[PDB]
Amino acid sequence: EYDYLFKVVLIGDSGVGKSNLLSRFTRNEFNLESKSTIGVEFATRSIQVDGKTIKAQIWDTARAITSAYYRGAVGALLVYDIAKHLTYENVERWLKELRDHADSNIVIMLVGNKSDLRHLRAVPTDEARAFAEKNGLSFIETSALDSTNVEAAFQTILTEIY
Amino acid sequence: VTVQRKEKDFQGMLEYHKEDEALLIRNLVTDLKPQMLSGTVPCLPAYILYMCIRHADYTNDDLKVHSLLTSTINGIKKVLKKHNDDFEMTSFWLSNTCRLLHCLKQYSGDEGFMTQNTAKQNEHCLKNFDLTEYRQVLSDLSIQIYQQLIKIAEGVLQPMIVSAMLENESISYCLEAIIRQMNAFHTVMCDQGLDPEIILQVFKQLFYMINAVTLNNLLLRKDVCSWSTGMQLRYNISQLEEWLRGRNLHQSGAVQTMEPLIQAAQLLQLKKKTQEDAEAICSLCTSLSTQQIVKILNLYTPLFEERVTVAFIRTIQAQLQERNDPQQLLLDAKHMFPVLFPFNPSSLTMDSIHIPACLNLEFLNEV
């Protein structure tokens, strides 16, 4: 039913909105009531790229497992919460975990989520943009809650994989 | 010197002379292949049948009513028995039987069923006969046809489940093969105008089966329990859950019946060593019995990776001791939820319905 299938993975501190980013992209739903991710969770969606039908297979998460999680992944969304500076400091660690287990050729996108929380902002866009440029990461600010840029995020990262 | 007849326009009744009742049943029930109604509205046979019943009621022929219904019911049963493997036919007749029952309620004359009728529909109600008891019979028959439907469907899926849910690695039958089959089921039930509430409950039932069969298989196989199969398993379930959303069946309750199998898939992935890991498992696995949780842990086989200790398993058994879990290890894969058949009055009007020529009922006279 599709022509290419791309494994794409979600990573970042708990509570930054990976699961809602997944549920907003794949089924256009969002919950204020945080439901725990347990083990690895999945969701897919067929997206159009060129004249090609790509099945975005998005992985989500709460040691051997850690390698099965990154192995094969051709894309990743590295997510933090623009309202919680700690989740952004941790991005360096998640970057190291990624580069240890994934293919060098993986396309990586830094994602500052919860951009609707403008009045609570803890991580200025410019700093995060700089960090991404420095480490060769694509960058974007999303809100799973009001949906701003969620479509563009996955669309963008899937388009850079080809 | 002769009782003449009053002239009037078609009133939506069908008349046959008592001699042709056998033929009616043959051309309208026994020999009626579903595909012969390719391009008409659904459940035409139901409507036709009620038009014949109206006319029996109109002429106060209480013998012709009893004979017509009794002969139809026996006809349907005879068809469903000869075609006890045929999912199309079973679904066809479950649809017509229900719609017939809908017509007997909507046009019963009892105010309670007629709150949604148009002025022109209220005209077409039964005048003389209260057929409550025949409705009760038709209602029973529909339970039976429903049960034959689930049988046929489960009978087709059962051999596919284990290979499709566990064995095949996507991240002999593949999960796609199960989806193509359920698609076909959904498409038959739709094209034949089976009540959506019934389509829902049918898929709720099929999914409870997939749950029970897969989980039982996990609980009897040591080789197949590991985190890797937990992952494939979870992905496969999430693929089934997305199928449901795609056909608008996500409110059937199907998802909820898979909760045990989902928790078994999560259990397979969870850490299982520290006191912390044991508190989590008991918090999570609310839909698995103590024995089942314990069973999956004893069967847990790693791929660099350790096995589940005896002290760990005894630590779990102690926490779950407070709750009284069932003595049966396995789920009843053949458990059957009792179905609720709704009442769904239509807006079709008896006087606008005409039999297509392909049905061979020229001997029916439009009154």
Ligand SMILES: Nc1nc2c(ncn2[C@@H]2O[C@H](COP(=O)(O)OP(=O)(O)O)[C@@H](O)[C@H]2O)c(=O)[nH]1
């Ligand atoms: N305000 C706001 N809250 C969000 C957004 N995305 C997720 N959340 C909230 O953050 C909490 C954790 O979300 P979740 O997706 O479960 O985080 P995860 O652990 O990374 O998957 C939940 O209460 C959500 O309501 C967003 O864009 N804006």
Ligand SMILES: [Mg+2]
């Ligand atoms: Mg989550």
